[PDB]
Amino acid sequence: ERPTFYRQELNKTIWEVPERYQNLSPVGSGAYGSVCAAFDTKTGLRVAVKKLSRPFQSIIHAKRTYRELRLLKHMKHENVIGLLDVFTPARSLEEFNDVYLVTHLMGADLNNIVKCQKLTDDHVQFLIYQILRGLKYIHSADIIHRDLKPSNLAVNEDCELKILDFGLARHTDDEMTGYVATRWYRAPEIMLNWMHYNQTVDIWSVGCIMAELLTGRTLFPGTDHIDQLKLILRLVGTPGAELLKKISSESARNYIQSLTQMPKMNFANVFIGANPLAVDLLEKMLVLDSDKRITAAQALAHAYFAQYHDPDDEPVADPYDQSFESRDLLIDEWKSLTYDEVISFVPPPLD
Numbered sequence: 001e002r003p004t005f006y007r008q009e010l011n012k013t014i015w016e017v018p019e020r021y022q023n024l025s026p027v028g029s030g031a032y033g034s035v036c037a038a039f040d041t042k043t044g045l046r047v048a049v050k051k052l053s054r055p056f057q058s059i060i061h062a063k064r065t066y067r068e069l070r071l072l073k074h075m076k077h078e079n080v081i082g083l084l085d086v087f088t089p090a091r092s093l094e095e096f097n098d099v100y101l102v103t104h105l106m107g108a109d110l111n112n113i114v115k116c117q118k119l120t121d122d123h124v125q126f127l128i129y130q131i132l133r134g135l136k137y138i139h140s141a142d143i144i145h146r147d148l149k150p151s152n153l154a155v156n157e158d159c160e161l162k163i164l165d166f167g168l169a170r171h172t173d174d175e176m177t178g179y180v181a182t183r184w185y186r187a188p189e190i191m192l193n194w195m196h197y198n199q200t201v202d203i204w205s206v207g208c209i210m211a212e213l214l215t216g217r218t219l220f221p222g223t224d225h226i227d228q229l230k231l232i233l234r235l236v237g238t239p240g241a242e243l244l245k246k247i248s249s250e251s252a253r254n255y256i257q258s259l260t261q262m263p264k265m266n267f268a269n270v271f272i273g274a275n276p277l278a279v280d281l282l283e284k285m286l287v288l289d290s291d292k293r294i295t296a297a298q299a300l301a302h303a304y305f306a307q308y309h310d311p312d313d314e315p316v317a318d319p320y321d322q323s324f325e326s327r328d329l330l331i332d333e334w335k336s337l338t339y340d341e342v343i344s345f346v347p348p349p350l351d
């Protein structure tokens with residue numbers, strides 16, 4: 001039952017893959033892992049094959065490997081990335097070192113859609129509808145994506161959308177620093193490690209993305225964390241008394257209280273020309289108090305999506321057992337857990 005593998009070196013990396021994958025072409029490397037595009041002869045699909053870099057190099061990296069695999073094996077939804085395959089060339093746990101993941105090859109992401117194309121309001125409705133449908137699913141499993149931004153959303157020629165890679169390993173400090181797209185969609189409460197936070201951080205991200213689709217420009221293109229905060233508070237207003245209570249870092253409170261009080265702006269005067277319903281939705285997403293932000297299931301029922309909303313076709317997820325997150329194991333234990341997950345993988349049907 002084990003398939004036959006063949007080897008080849010591409011840009012100083014050995015790839016050993018099942019024969020079913022053909023015409024491997026390097027596509028990139030850095031998000032630690034090399035990625036090749038290939039043709040999968042068994043499904044007829046163009047696929048991206050990611051070879052993980054040093055998956056069990058430390059406890060941290062081994063747990064991260066486990067976490068990514070568990071998450072990708074769970075996601076089964078039209079608007080979310082899933083796993084077509086996962087494999088290793090090893091024939092036993094004792095020689096298990098390398099892990100390859102396989103998913104659908106995506107073309108365009110939303111960034112180059114917003115940069116290269118004029119979207120109508122109908123396109124904005126459809127794109128945002130699909131992000132919220134996918135996010136309803138994700139959140140119903142008690143998973144937080146954490147890294148929703150246009151480059152993480154694949155969009156095909158029919159404007160059909162998929163949410164791609166989850167924020168799994170926290171980004172390094174340096175890659176969130178300065179004038180960088182990496183931070184522009186992040187919710188204020190997690191911009192610094194200064195509050196604990198919920199699923200609705202992803203809803204803030206969606207509001208930022210929706211605003212950019214509507215204007216064609218970044219809503220909060222901050223030059224650093226503090227510049228970005230000031231852009232945010234200028235739009236949504238400074239926190240009142242109700243909300244300053246709920247903040248618990250004293251140092252955060254203390255900086256926040258140094259700021260001059262600003263009222264919430266009028267969104268109809270920021271988003272000139274936009275559908276009044278879109279503006280209404282944005283006001284419900286872009287709220288500082290994260291307890292009061294609209295949820296994805298709530299947002300799907302908003303009147304802006306009246307032409308796409310179907311309550312019998314917005315599925316929720318099977319339960320996702322995340323108890324491993326609180327568990328402490330050695331490298332070889334994490335690794336053996338990963339091996340069982342590779343070995344038990346069962347592919348999606350061609351129907």
Ligand SMILES: Oc1ccccc1Cl
Pocket residue numbers: 035048049050072101102103165
């Ligand atoms: O980003 C991913 C995820 C799973 C498989 C392949 C790639 Cl490139």
